[PDB]
Scaffold this active site. Structure first.
Site, PDB file in Angstrom:
ATOM      1  CG  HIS A 102      -3.174  -2.238   9.059  1.00 13.35           C
ATOM      2  ND1 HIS A 102      -4.342  -2.249   8.327  1.00 13.35           N
ATOM      3  CD2 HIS A 102      -2.284  -2.982   8.357  1.00 13.35           C
ATOM      4  CE1 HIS A 102      -4.170  -2.976   7.236  1.00 13.35           C
ATOM      5  NE2 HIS A 102      -2.933  -3.438   7.234  1.00 13.35           N
ATOM      6  CE  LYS A 104       2.473  -1.338  10.981  1.00  8.76           C
ATOM      7  NZ  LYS A 104       1.551  -2.477  11.127  1.00  8.76           N
ATOM      8  CG  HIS A 327       6.106  -0.288   6.272  1.00  9.77           C
ATOM      9  ND1 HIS A 327       5.705  -0.174   7.587  1.00  9.77           N
ATOM     10  CD2 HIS A 327       5.354  -1.278   5.732  1.00  9.77           C
ATOM     11  CE1 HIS A 327       4.737  -1.041   7.827  1.00  9.77           C
ATOM     12  NE2 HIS A 327       4.512  -1.730   6.720  1.00  9.77           N
ATOM     13  CE  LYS A 329       1.743   2.065   5.886  1.00 11.09           C
ATOM     14  NZ  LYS A 329       2.873   1.319   6.429  1.00 11.09           N
TER      15      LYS A 329
HETATM   16  N1  LIG Z   1      -1.691  -6.936   5.698  1.00 11.25           N
HETATM   17  C1  LIG Z   1      -0.932  -5.703   5.574  1.00 11.25           C
HETATM   18  C2  LIG Z   1      -1.009  -4.960   4.411  1.00 11.25           C
HETATM   19  C3  LIG Z   1      -0.280  -3.788   4.306  1.00 11.25           C
HETATM   20  C4  LIG Z   1       0.525  -3.362   5.351  1.00 11.25           C
HETATM   21  C5  LIG Z   1       1.284  -2.047   5.182  1.00 11.25           C
HETATM   22  O1  LIG Z   1       1.266  -1.195   6.109  1.00 11.25           O
HETATM   23  O2  LIG Z   1       1.888  -1.805   4.108  1.00 11.25           O
HETATM   24  C6  LIG Z   1       0.578  -4.093   6.525  1.00 11.25           C
HETATM   25  C7  LIG Z   1       1.436  -3.678   7.717  1.00 11.25           C
HETATM   26  O3  LIG Z   1       2.656  -3.452   7.571  1.00 11.25           O
HETATM   27  O4  LIG Z   1       0.908  -3.597   8.849  1.00 11.25           O
HETATM   28  C8  LIG Z   1      -0.146  -5.270   6.629  1.00 11.25           C
END
Ligand SMILES: Nc1ccc(C(=O)O)c(C(=O)O)c1
EC number: 3.1.4.-
Length: 438
Positions: A102, A104, A327, A329
């Site tokens: 996940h 970034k 989006h 968190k």
């Molecule tokens: N397979 C995923 C499930 C949820 C998310 C999120 O962050 O909402 C992501 C993402 O954006 O990396 C990927």
């Protein structure tokens, strides 16, 4: 401001709500540095789009894509990158089932130094178009002179901690970036790194990752105040995992317990969870398609209806972003009247055991499935006891923290429901005239 916390630009809001915001083209601009090389850690990539976001003069500099894709997904990503000879790929190992890469993060190596960007957006047009996303921008880190011996370390240990996060990949392309970081001076960094990596951690290693990492930092670098039991915990996210059959299984037993830690000594603390309602999504700038990026499944949700009594609507008048679905968190610890916060975290981690870790083996082992990354703002790292909450995100002391959504959070109404992405909504149309039929 000392915090260097930004939102992405949102198309369609008034200019005053984008004045201090950053688009990806701003981050990659030559004004931020003369690019030599970059690494893009992420989940989803549109490579054609991504290369177009670099300045034309930098589009042939080496780019490393760090991802978690396997099998046909991995083949698709390689096919995307094949036209660009300057793009290399690093597949992050995901050896525990149901894990995700996940994180970034951008590593930006310049002629002038190095910059680290930890943020919440996928590298696709839609994630930077009309969503609420968060960015932390590091200072420009200068290079340490060849032959000079200094640590380059910050009081928050960010340099060693970022190297430790990268070492966990065990990847040759990332050892190259570790060597780059070693050569730069990161001492000005005033945030703490909070990472998750896949594994089963016991003993000392338990405090390295996930919610135990957060707990350790709060124990060591925050102080408890009188009436601390009255300071709520706020969590705000775009996806929800399976948390168990009741709140005692994980949410209030280890997750909340880590988040309410303050100081070294030894619950009715209120817990607010912010997650878009169906009505939030319907009336959003994107309409129902925003829900494609809020991936809470009906199979998960119907096993934990107890959870939704914790849910509060998305509202962001302070930053003009009530209709820009989140989006980002974030997690934070406000005072009982929400005028101050004891700390603030922006991260990739959603409300899930995969992201934060779950205790195993009679509470002696923390198991994490995924890669996650965020940065923690602690008042002590700025010479403060607490942060004042900024009244308007983009308005004018600079020791006030820019919380990007409204406080106090507003509980769902009796007719509200959490956004669940794989059931239809056909009662009322969205802002583009459409229904939602998965
Ligand atoms: N397979 C995923 C499930 C949820 C998310 C999120 O962050 O909402 C992501 C993402 O954006 O990396 C990927």
């Amino acid at each position: 401001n000392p915090f260097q916390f930004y939102l992405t630009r949102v198309s369609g809001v008034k200019p005053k709500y984008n004045s201090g915001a950053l688009h990806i083209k701003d981050i990659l601009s030559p004004l931020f540095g003369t690019l030599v090389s970059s690494a893009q850690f992420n989940y989803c990539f549109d490579v054609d789009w991504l290369v177009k976001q670099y300045p034309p003069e930098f589009r042939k500099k080496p780019i490393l894509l760090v991802h978690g894709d396997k099998r046909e997904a991995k083949a698709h990503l390689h096919a995307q990158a094949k036209p660009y000879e300057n793009i290399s790929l690093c597949q992050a190992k995901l050896d525990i089932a149901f894990g995700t890469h996940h994180t970034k993060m951008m590593l930006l190596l310049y002629e002038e130094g190095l910059r680290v960007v930890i943020h919440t957006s996928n590298l696709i047009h839609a994630d930077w178009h009309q969503k609420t996303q968060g960015i932390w921008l590091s200072p420009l880190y200068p290079r340490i002179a060849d032959g000079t011996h200094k640590s380059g370390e910050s009081p928050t240990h960010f340099k060693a901690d970022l190297i430790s996060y990268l070492m966990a990949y065990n990847a040759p392309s990332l050892k190259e970036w570790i060597d780059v970081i070693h050569k730069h001076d990161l001492s000005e960094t005033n945030v703490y790194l909070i990472g998750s990596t896949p594994g089963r951690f016991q003993g000392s290693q338990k405090d390295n990752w996930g919610h135990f990492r957060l707990k350790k930092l709060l124990k060591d670098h925050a102080s408890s105040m009188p009436n601390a039991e009255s300071w709520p915990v706020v969590g705000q996210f775009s996806s929800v995992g399976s948390l168990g059959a009741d709140e005692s299984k994980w949410l209030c037993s280890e997750f909340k317990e880590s988040m309410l830690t303050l100081g070294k000594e030894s619950s009715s603390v209120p817990l607010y969870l912010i997650y878009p309602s169906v009505e939030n999504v319907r009336t959003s700038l994107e309409g129902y398609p925003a829900g494609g990026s809020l991936p809470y499944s009906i199979q998960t949700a119907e096993k934990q209806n107890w959870l939704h009594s914790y849910f509060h609507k998305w509202s962001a008048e302070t930053s003009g972003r009530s209709n820009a679905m989140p989006h980002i968190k974030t997690y934070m610890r406000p005072s009982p009247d929400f005028s101050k916060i004891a700390w603030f975290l922006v991260t990739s981690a959603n409300l899930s055991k995969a992201a934060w870790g779950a205790l195993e083996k009679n509470g002696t082992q923390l198991m994490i499935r995924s890669y996650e990354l965020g940065v923690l703002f602690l008042p002590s790292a700025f010479g403060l006891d607490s942060f004042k909450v900024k009244q308007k995100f983009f308005a004018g002391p600079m020791a006030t923290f820019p919380v990007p959504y409204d406080l106090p959070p507003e509980l769902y109404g009796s007719k509200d429901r959490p956004w669940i992405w794989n059931i239809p909504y056909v009662k009322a149309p969205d802002t583009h005239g459409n229904m939602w039929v998965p």
